[PDB]
């Protein structure tokens, strides 16, 4: 638990799934990012349960949750400040400046984070570039793993909802809500596409229904220029119809490191 007096709210930096994000300071010295959880956004008591375990999850390629500020309404989550924001934004902003090796390095970072979560029996559920953050020396860290379990907006959570992230969803997820580390693997493949495409939106921004149809019939994203023949076959292995035909993150890590 972080005491409210230990935090200083400096400036609003944006809004996400659960509401406001501020740049702040922790004990008047260290830069932190503070999520202010908006009313009706979170399943609050259910999260305060899972907060202890989430905090205990620690890895250099996961954005660290430093603590929870509970002694106030609305409650706040205190995070490691990532100096370059979301990967999705970062890729688009820096488009044209990336060497293939740097882009591969980003995929490696994410894969290391996911390998840790997979090992720890944790499903992300919404792995995408928008949910990864960029820190010192372009290091990429995975964030908000498992958080969609606490989202009250049924448009996001339900596979049939209008806000459902179909573009990163494996066939068994969008059809049957069947999550696993292997469904995160599908998402990771799409994230690889995003990285090597320098932040392009997968599936020409096609409708949710059209993507479901595309994937159901066998369509797959085409190779981005900066992705090698080898990288593209790794992507395609992530997009096998059956989750059992997809590699584990532990395997992908060996493959991406071997390059
Ligand atoms: C995936 O969602 C999130 C996950 C985490 C885990 C955190 S906790 C965080 C940890 N670290 C963060 N860093 C940043 O959000 C950031 C953004 C911009 C800049 C560059 N300009 C700075 C210096 C300002 C905005 C002060 C001018 C630097 C850092 S947020 C915040 C969000 C989130 O909701 N947003 C990310 C950042 N946003 C925007 C508009 O960029 C708002 C949505």
Curated annotation (Swiss-Prot):
Which segments constitute the Protein kinase domain?
Answer: 7-259
Q: Which UniProt keywords apply?
A: Adaptive immunity, ATP-binding, Cytoplasm, Disease variant, Immunity, Kinase, Metal-binding, Nucleotide-binding, Nucleus, Phosphoprotein, SH2 domain, SH3 domain, Transferase, Tyrosine-protein kinase, Ubl conjugation, Zinc, Zinc-finger
Q: Which amino acid positions bind ATP, per UniProt? A: 13-21, 35
**Tissue specificity field:** T-cell lines and natural killer cell lines.
| List of residues that carry Phosphoserine | 209
Record note on modification: Phosphorylated at Tyr-156 in the activation loop of the kinase domain by LCK. Ubiquitinated.
Disulfide bond sites = none
Q: Name one GO molecular function term.
A: non-membrane spanning protein tyrosine kinase activity
Locations listed in the record: Cytoplasm; Nucleus
> Which residues are annotated as modified residue Phosphotyrosine in the UniProt record?
156
Tell me where on the tree of life, at the top rank, the source sits.
Answer: Eukaryota
A Gene Ontology biological process noted in the UniProt record is: B cell receptor signaling pathway
Q: Which residues form the active site?
A: 126
Q: Changing residue 95 to Q: what effect? A: In a gastric adenocarcinoma sample; somatic mutation
According to its UniProt record, which protein family does this protein belong to? Belongs to the protein kinase superfamily. Tyr protein kinase family. TEC subfamily.
The Swiss-Prot or TrEMBL note on domains reads: The N-terminal PH domain allows ITK to be recruited to the plasma membrane by an activated PI3 kinase. This domain also contains a proline-rich region (PRR). The adjoining domain is a SH3 domain, which binds to PRR (from itself or from other proteins). Next, a SH2 domain is required for binding tyrosine-phosphorylated substrates. In the C-terminal region, the kinase domain is required for tyrosine phosphorylation.
Assembly description: Homooligomerizes; this association negatively regulates kinase activity. Interacts with PPIA/CYPA; this interaction regulates TCR signal strength via a proline-directed conformational switch in ITK. Interacts with THEMIS. Interacts with FASLG. Interacts with VAV1; this interaction is important for VAV1 localization and TCR-induced actin polarization. Interacts with TBX21.
Q: Can you say what this protein is called?
A: Tyrosine-protein kinase ITK/TSK
Naturally occurring in which organism (per UniProt): Homo sapiens (Human)
Which part of the entire protein is covered? 357 to 615 of 620
